[PDB]
Amino acid sequence: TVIKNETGTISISQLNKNVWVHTELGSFNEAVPSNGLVLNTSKGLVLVDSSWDDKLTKELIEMVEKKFQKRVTDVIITHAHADCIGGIKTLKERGIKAHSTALTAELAKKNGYEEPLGDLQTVTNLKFGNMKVETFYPGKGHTEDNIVVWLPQYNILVGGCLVKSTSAKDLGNVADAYVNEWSTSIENVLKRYRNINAVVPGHGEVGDKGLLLHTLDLLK
């Protein structure tokens, strides 16, 4: 089940019961899709990452709140990049709690973005209604602050930008990346979660554990 906006720049696809994937196309150098999650809980909507900017983020929020007729209460920022923290301003003005590690908050500030909470520790478990969410900082990789999100009830891993999609042959922006450490961080994810079912890459189609292996291959 996929749902879009008249424009086709924002779409949400059902992964499981209360887990949907939101994807927005940014307009640069042209369309680059970015993934996030929408968690439909008994106490509101929880998102994993916002969008490229405030306009897209606001549109995304308006779309899901209308679809599920609920308030987006929290958002987990996986790292300080436009495709993830781009709509932080929209979040703060709507009373949406922007969770992040202290490091992500520090880098967000350094990059001219409003500051997220900086509340997430290396391992943080959050439960919204009956929806369980675990955030984990595996170490430096795509960026210094990148974290992954794990949904234990579904064994779904949001690898975010630390994980490349099956068709990706490029690592993307590595100016802020720690290429040599990237591999170790992915192994920490692989060692921590040994029963991964679905894996959501930062960009591209949902896959499985093979995406992490594919990324390690690109890094060799």
| Site for Zn ion, rule CB under 5 A | 81, 83, 161, 202
Catalytic residue check, 214 = no
79 appears as a binding residue in the annotation: yes
208 appears as a binding residue in the annotation: no
- Cβ-based nearer residue to Zn ion, 84 or 131: 84
Q: How far is the CB of 176 from Zn ion (least distance, A)?
A: 7
In the set 79, 99, 145, 214, the catalytic residue is 79
Task: Give the separation between CA 199 and CA 205, rounded to whole angstroms.
Answer: 9
Q: How far is the CB of 23 from Zn ion (least distance, A)?
A: 12
- Cβ-based nearer residue to Zn ion, 151 or 161: 161
84 appears as a binding residue in the annotation: no
- Residue 219 corresponds to which tokens in the numbers above? 């890094």
Catalytic residue check, 142 = yes
In the set 142, 145, 146, 214, the catalytic residue is 142
**Buried-state track 180-211, b at ≥16 Cβ within 10 A, e below 16:** eebbebbebbbeebeebebbbbbbbebbebeb
- Residue 45 corresponds to which tokens in the numbers above? 């909507």
For residues 64 and 74, is the Cβ–Cβ distance under 8 A? no
- Residue 188 corresponds to which tokens in the numbers above? 């920490």
Closest residue to Zn ion, Cβ-based? 81
164 appears as a binding residue in the annotation: yes
Strands (E), the chain: 2-4, 10-14, 19-27, 31-41, 44-48, 72-76, 97-99, 123-128, 131-136, 148-151, 156-160, 198-201
Q: How far is the CB of 78 from Zn ion (least distance, A)?
A: 8
Any idea what DSSP says for residue 120?
B
Catalytic residue check, 74 = no
3-class SS of residue 20: strand
In the set 83, 99, 145, 214, the catalytic residue is 83
Q: How far is the CB of 88 from Zn ion (least distance, A)?
A: 14
Q: Within 10 A of 82 (CB to CB), how many other CB atoms are there?
A: 16
214 appears as a binding residue in the annotation: no
- Position 119: which residue type? D
- Look at the block and give the residue holding tokens 């927005």: 24
In the set 111, 173, 180, 197, the catalytic residue is 173
Residues flagged as binding site? 79, 81, 83, 142, 161, 164, 173, 203
Residues flagged as binding site for substrate? 164, 173
Provide the annotated active-site residues. Answer: 79, 81, 83, 142, 173
Residues flagged as binding site for Zn(2+)? 79, 81, 83, 142, 161, 203
